[PDB]
Each structure stands twice: as structure tokens, then as C-alpha cells.
Amino acid sequence: SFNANLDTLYRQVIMDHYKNPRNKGVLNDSIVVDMNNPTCGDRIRLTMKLDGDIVEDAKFEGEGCSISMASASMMTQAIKGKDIETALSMSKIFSDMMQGKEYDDSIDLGDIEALQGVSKFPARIKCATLSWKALEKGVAKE
Template identity: 40%
Template structure:
């Protein structure tokens, strides 16, 4: 990662950590899930309003490190107003970039590409993916299911 790319990464992460977009609660979410990472204390809930196969609105709440919060903030911007299928594909591409399966340039991540540098820090990949895990669990949840039924704790993170 060049110095310019590293500066952009740090700037984007800090901007989204200081002023996260789509942070808070929806008045009446029809899909929701919670993700926790007991190893580092990250704990996020994702709430969705999904109508006719489209993510009409999204909010997240909780606490986490700068990477966790920035990634969830950028996730909200990236999926809000888009089809569920597009959100699922974006999650797959984002995950593939962070795990080194594909190169950032091939993934068509938009602004999310600024988080590609996280892949150089394996212990932080779970931080960047936590909100995305919760999003996928929320999307898979039946609209009237109990929120407790959708726990998005990443594999290998049980207490």
C-alpha cells in the first residue's frame, strides 16, 4: 500500500468512526441481527427495512473499534436503496478482498475499496466484517422472526 493509499484509508476510517452514517435505530425494522466479537469487544446490531426485495433503509448501533464502525457505516451507505441480491454480492466481494481471494481492483467495491488495506492485518479482518455478517444474518431472517434468533457472531468467536 502506497503512502497515499494508507493516508486515504486512515482518513476514511476516521471520518466514518467520528461521524458514522446510518447509526441508530429504525422505528419499525422488519429484519435485524446482532454480531459480536468477544475477542475484542465489538458488538453491533443491524436493523433493516426490506420491502419488495430492496433494502429501503438500514441502521446499525453498538460499539466497536474504528475499523468495525467505519466498515458498518460504509456498508450502510453502500446497500441502502439497493436490491437484497446486490447487497449479498457486495458482501461476498468485500469479504473476498479482505481475505485475499480477489484483488481490490477486481471487486468493484466503490468507496469500500479504501478498507482493502485491512487485509494486511489478519486480526482486524473480523472487525471489518462484523457488520457485514450481521447484515447477511438479518437478510436471511424471516421478517417476523425474533431478533435473538439472528446472532451473527463470526465463526471461531465463541466465548
């Protein structure tokens, strides 16, 4: 069916980020945040190189389900070059998309919109948010 094909296309984007992750590794001279989601057993180490308040670079290492690792990939791709304020606005928009609301759709959220499917399964919301919590934890360390 058509809804099925659209779901499959979304899923193919998510699997592209899971099997072709962006920004894998660990940055030198960076903020390091470790974060884990015991409710799925996902763990991530996010590093961020900030130029003042500009996300100059962001990498992650980790192990978890397709959702958490794909979300980390999409987040690192989406926030690079943005200021902290914009990254946090993107985090709030993503949270709203996760909660099922009408999120702000006039700022570059890139690949992240494929993760809207996950609002359908509440238990998987934690997977999708792991990286963003690390991001927030990262930038509340100034």
C-alpha cells in the same frame, strides 16, 4: 513517502467513517440483528427496513474499534437502495477484498474500498466483517 501518504489518505477515509458515521440509530418496524465479535469485543445492532427485496433503509448502533464501526457505516451507506441479491454480492466481493483476492470492481462499493488495508492484518478481518455478517444473518430471516 508516497506509499505513506496514500496509506494516510485511506486511513483518513476510515477515520471519516468512524468519527462521522452514516446511518446511526435504530429503525422502527425493521429486521433487528445483534452481532458481536468477542475477539475484539465489538458489538453491533443492525436494523433493516426492506421494501420487498429492496434495502429501503439500514441503521446501526454499536461499540467497537475504528475498523468495525467504520465498516458498519460504509456498509449501511453502500447497500441502501440495493436489492438483497446485490447486497449479498457486495458482501462476497468485500470478503474477497478481505482475503486479498482480486475483487469485482464494477459495482458501486463506495467507501468500502478504503477497508482493503485491513486485509494486511488478519486478526482485524473479523472487525471489518462484523456488520456484513449481521447483514447476511439479517436477510436469511427473509
